[PDB]
Design a protein around this ligand. Structure first.
Ligand SMILES: [Mg+2]
Ligand code: NA
Ligand code: NA
Length: 327
DNA sequence: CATTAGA
DNA sequence: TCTAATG
């Protein structure tokens, strides 16, 4: 956690660069298990060799370790850190809709800067076009102060359209968070569950509504179960307009809300931990259900859930408000 | 790890 | 269809 820091840090730096600049999923996958193990290790790694004893720890990495322990640096990292080619791939990648694959290609053609991207908007698809458009806004955190007004809005329209719609703003904002990165609205409807052959309109009706009023300004992607857009709060009585914010709304078979709900609310650790527990407690939990476990090794049989509670009760635990789902 | 764009 | 990019 702090004893093997630099080591794992230098480790993940390296990996990352494999997978990103180079297309070496392998090496990258290397740096990572290593980084993974050294991470667990209970003692100050003193040299390559000590490290070396580890599983995943070959001579290659063990060797970086020495150089790093000897000199507080690393050439390869000093070298990658310099390399514009590589620096470029790192950056372009920040544009929403631009993965590595494309970052490389762009770079190839010679799109390295934000401006390059500009003079060449043509080479970019819708997503990237928008991603490039709202570059500054996407990078900004969402103050809860606004998180609230946004949540407010969405809530309203949903209701206005069908009264039977249930929506929850999941994520860290759900958990208290002072700021958030984007908005995650989970959604369902009675009329839609595990069997009932869809109702695409269900997602659609709502999107349209949000748009109608001008909350949603664009679309990154809209399918029959997951809409991925951009919104903005009515820019008041001027002098102050709002930043464009990423939004996602997904449809859910009412028969799986709460789990999904549970889940998306995190946190990553709270989840896992709860998760590990349901286990002992004789269960299983995934992004959609909670299955009683059986002796033969494994088992099925989706237990019925009406609220976050049920999940709780099942594995017999103390209902933890989102506030404290911290870990 | 599953959902969408695209080509 | 496969393959990329989000989450
Ligand atoms: Mg994005
Ligand atoms: Na080893
Ligand atoms: Na990106």
């Amino acid at each position: 956690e702090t004893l093997n820091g630099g080591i794992t840090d230098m480790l993940t730096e390296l990996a990352n660069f494999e997978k990103n600049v180079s297309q070496a999923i392998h090496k990258y996958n290397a740096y990572r298990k290593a980084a993974s193990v050294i991470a667990k290790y209970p003692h100050k790694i003193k040299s390559g060799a000590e490290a070396k004893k580890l599983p995943g720890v070959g001579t290659k990495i063990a060797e970086k370790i020495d150089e790093f322990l000897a000199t507080g640096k690393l050439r390869k990292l000093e070298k990658i850190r310099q390399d514009d080619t590589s620096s470029s791939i790192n950056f372009l990648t920040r544009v929403s809709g631009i993965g590595p694959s494309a970052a490389r290609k762009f770079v190839d053609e010679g799109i390295k800067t934000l401006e390059d991207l500009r003079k060449n908007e043509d080479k970019l698809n819708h997503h990237q076009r928008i991603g490039l458009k709202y570059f500054g806004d996407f990078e900004k955190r969402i103050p809860r102060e606004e998180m609230l007004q946004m949540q407010d809005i969405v809530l309203n329209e949903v209701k206005k359209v069908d009264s039977e719609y249930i929506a929850t703003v999941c994520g860290s904002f759900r958990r208290g968070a002072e700021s958030s990165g984007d908005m995650d609205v989970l959604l369902t409807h009675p009329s839609f569950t595990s069997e009932s052959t869809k109702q695409p309109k269900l997602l659609h009706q709502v999107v349209e509504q949000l748009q109608k009023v001008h909350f949603i300004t664009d679309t990154l992607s809209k399918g029959e179960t997951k809409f991925m857009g951009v919104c903005q709060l009515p820019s008041k009585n001027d002098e102050k307009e709002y930043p464009h914010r990423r939004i996602d709304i997904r449809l859910i078979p009412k028969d799986q809300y709460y789990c999904g709900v549970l889940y998306f609310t995190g946190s990553d650790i709270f989840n896992k931990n709860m998760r590990a527990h349901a286990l002992e407690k004789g269960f299983t939990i995934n992004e959609y259900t909670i299955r009683p476990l059986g002796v033969t090794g494994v088992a099925g049989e989706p237990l019925p859930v009406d609220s976050e509670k049920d999940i709780f009760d099942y594995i017999q635990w103390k209902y933890r408000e989102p506030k404290d789902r911290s870990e």
